[PDB]
């Protein structure tokens, strides 16, 4: 009974102390990586029919 709560607290205290970063920096890195690879995405930019094996 108490052992369950003890293990849960021990595992949660590791989550308590964690390398937290500002949401601003996380969003900036997300946007940077998303716009850097924007060219290599076929779905983002519909490609013509001869370049896709599914067209013909």
């Amino acid at each position: 009974s108490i052992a369950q709560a003890r293990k849960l607290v021990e595992q949660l205290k590791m989550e308590a102390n964690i390398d937290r970063i500002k949401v601003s920096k996380a969003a900036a890195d997300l946007m940077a990586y998303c716009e850097a690879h924007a060219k290599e995405d076929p779905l983002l930019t519909p490609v013509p029919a001869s370049e896709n094996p599914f067209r013909e």
Binding site: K22, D29, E35, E40
Partner: protein
């Protein structure tokens, strides 16, 4: 009376955890990345339809080759298709007709599946001179096998309805590692690019990040009001999206350790059955019980298309490792490729 006082110690730990999560909330993605206007509307047309299943399709998964895929049907069959020539390359009859997951073993040589049998069946596709035969059967899970993904050619990560995950070694056949901490049925799992961490979503409305080597839980993410049916990693590897039965997707960031953004439309109120990203991560596709799949702009949470070619519940959705197309499978016994 130490149990309740430790419960309140956890209460205070959560109080200061929420305080720190708010302290790091300097701004929001919506305020920051608004300078870039919407990317525009996307429209993808069904370029193929794979027939042959005589019952509901419950799962699929793409191979790293970007040409072959696998699907499991309630009729008791596991079919490996080729999406180019739409020719059924393999058709495996299973011992138990009740299957719910698939996996293609990026090595390209093995496949796996499982379900109400509580077993993970591994099928080898070498077939020197005989038809495909069950190569191994991993037993030990006490609940149905909800998801499974080959971490390597000899290791496999499995999620079960018994509220735990397990890393198995195929050769020996025992649970090399066990992952506990979820209080509900683990419904989905997703591996990271490097294979050093993986995120699992369960019916307890929670997603947990797990270290494969260490075996512990690093961070816990919450915010969903109901069961998480699907989960996918962001291509960069520092974020992940979760789809739930509360008609909503949610993008969480690892480093931030908090809910980054949400994707929900007042028009859609059904459950989400699958989620995926595009190779660039901008587009977030989500399969729904509405018989259709919705596209979202990850950075701004704006619908940017819809896929409608199925007459029944869209059960599985996937995007190839090249991002050239998308595969959808539904209970109507048919699959479809888009773009």
């Amino acid at each position: 009376s130490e149990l309740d006082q430790l419960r309140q110690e956890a209460e205070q730990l959560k109080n200061q955890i929420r305080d720190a999560r708010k302290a790091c909330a300097d701004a929001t993605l919506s305020q920051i990345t608004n300078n870039i206007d919407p990317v525009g509307r996307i429209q993808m047309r069904t370029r193929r339809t794979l027939r042959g299943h005589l019952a509901k399709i419950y799962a699929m998964h793409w191979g790293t080759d970007s040409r072959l895929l696998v699907s499991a049907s309630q009729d008791g069959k596991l079919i490996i298709w080729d999406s180019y020539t739409t020719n059924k390359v393999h058709a495996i009859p299973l011992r138990s007709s009740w299957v719910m997951t698939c996996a293609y073993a990026p090595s390209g040589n093995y496949v796996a599946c499982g379900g109400l049998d509580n077993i993970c069946s591994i099928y080898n596709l070498k077939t020197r001179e005989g038809n495909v035969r069950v190569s191994r059967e991993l037993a030990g899970h006490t609940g149905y096998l909800s998801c499974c993904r080959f971490l390597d050619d000899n290791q496999i990560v499995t999620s079960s309805g018994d509220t735990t995950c397990a890393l198995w070694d195929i050769e020996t056949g025992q649970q090399t590692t066990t992952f506990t901490g979820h209080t509900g049925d683990v419904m989905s799992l997703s591996l990271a690019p490097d294979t050093r961490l993986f995120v699992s979503g369960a019916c307890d409305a929670s997603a947990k990040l797990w270290d494969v080597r260490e075996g512990m839980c690093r961070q816990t993410f919450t915010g969903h009001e109901s069961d998480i049916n699907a989960i996918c990693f962001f291509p960069n590897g520092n974020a992940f999206a979760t789809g739930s039965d509360d008609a909503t997707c949610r993008l969480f960031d690892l480093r931030a350790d908090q809910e980054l953004m949400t994707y929900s439309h007042d028009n859609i109120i059904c459950g989400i059955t699958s989620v995926s990203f595009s190779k660039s991560g901008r587009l977030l596709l989500a399969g729904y019980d509405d018989f259709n799949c919705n596209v979202w702009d990850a950075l701004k949470a704006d619908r940017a298309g819809v896929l409608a070619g199925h007459d029944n519940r869209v059960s599985c959705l996937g995007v190839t490792d090249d991002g050239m197309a998308v595969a959808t499978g539904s209970w109507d016994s048919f699959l479809k490729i888009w773009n």
